[PDB]
């Protein structure tokens, strides 16, 4: 059901990188990874948590829709794109933590915890501050657990409205052309070792869907592009994209 | 409110073609075109009619969701991509007329006419075969009328459910990257002169949306790629995309 293919390690070593790519063929219900152990090791979700956080905020009415404007609070942060107004689409695109921190406060701990349990999301532990726990609190998730969660989102099976799931899938849109559509979310965990990068989501084809979840050691910001590049080398090797 | 910019004609004449591009800046509520008259000239919608047809089929339950499979009827036809099973996503991508003819028959004349009147769509005239009138019946629509219809869809303001509009807009997804998202639909009017190609939809930016509608003289199928290419040259010239 899970098969290992150490061939992919070549795309990590070409950049003296280390990590795991997990793929799931939805038609055949078969998984593939370069590293079975690391595929099941849990890490901080970091900004991949904006997927569940969006769903809860939308379902509770904290976010009205994908056009609602969340005004910059006027405090300059050292990510330039955060110091402006955002909606859900742009907050996800630029991983605008302060917008999502405000969502999480309005959601509150009790509603956050029960939604994550209903989602079966990671260790479902929101130990810590409600507005930081996906960064430095108690929550952890593995690449295979990301796949399982994303599969439920793809099929509208999570315990939120169908509308909530459709809107988050819209906001996950990353790339599209006549060959594939990628809906996904990046993440970068920095507060505690090991510093890792995430890319999770799926590739939609005419006749199949390939779910994916990858994380990699990320000692500095200078390699963040490798999350997508290495994932794409594996997708190409497996003939999922040209 | 409307500006004529005949400088865009250079892109048409380069390919010894003729046509019109119409653009609408949603934030500024301002419109632009190379040919005010042809902007208002009504043509067969041809396969751009798959936009309202999709909406109607979804809102009436004729199409349950974007995953329902409409089986190929076994009759081999000249466009290979049509000779295969489809859902709403792939039927729109490959403009699979026979699938949408089935929709139209199930919708029926009465409900089709009522819907297009509720939509204020073109000249609202479905005279002819209930399953061919957008290609050889009485219906006609201009570029400016396409924009007016598309703006209502974008805003979920048409008189069908939000869900129906969300699903159609998902099916219209054509291109997406880090700079823009294009949701659009092509068309080729080939049954009754004059032979014309259509491309209509919108470009989503971080902080604005630019609606577009273009048609061009299209004597042979070999020029069809000009529809998107001339549109993008205009989009590039107006600095809307890089
Ligand atoms: C029939 C044929 C040749 O092509 N069939 C097509 C098709 O692609 N038709 C072309 C079209 O839509 O541009 C032309 N239709 C017209 C036109 O209808 O005016 C004539 C002239 N013509 C007249 C009567 C019957 C067929 C063709 C020539 S084919 C089609 C569309 S939807 C559907 N359910 N089939 C095939 O592949 O077997
Ligand atoms: Cl026909
Ligand atoms: Cl979408
Ligand atoms: Cl077409």
Author numbering:
A (entry chain A), B (entry chain C): 24 to 265
Tell me what the authors wrote about this structure, in their words.
Within the last decade, OXA-48 has become one of the most widespread serine β-lactamases. This Ambler class D β-lactamase confers resistance toward penicillins and decreases susceptibility to our last-resort drugs, the carbapenems. However, it is a poor hydrolyzer of extended-spectrum cephalosporins, including ceftazidime. Over the course of 300 generations, we identified seven single variants of OXA-48 (L67F, P68S, F72L, F156C/V, L158P, and G160C).
To investigate substrate binding, all OXA-48 variants were crystalized and soaked with ceftazidime. We were able to solve the crystal structure of L67F to 1.9 Å with four chains (A to D) in the asymmetric unit (space group P212121), which were arranged into two dimers (chains A/C and B/D). Chain C and D carried a hydrolyzed ceftazidime molecule approximately 9 Å away from the active site S70. The R1-group of ceftazidime including the dihydrothiazine ring demonstrated clear electron density (2Fo-Fc); however, no electron density was observed for the R2-ring (top). Here, we found that Q98, R100, D101, W105, V120, P121, Q124, L158, T213, and R214 formed a cryptic pocket outside the active side and that these residues were involved in stabilizing the hydrolyzed ceftazidime molecule (top). D101, Q124, T213, and R214 were found to interact with ceftazidime via H-bonds. In the L67F variant, both with and without ceftazidime, L158 and I215 were shifted by 1 to 2 Å, respectively. While in the wild-type structure, the W221 side chain forms a water-mediated H-bond to the backbone nitrogen of M237, in L67F, W221 formed a H-bond to the main chain of F67.
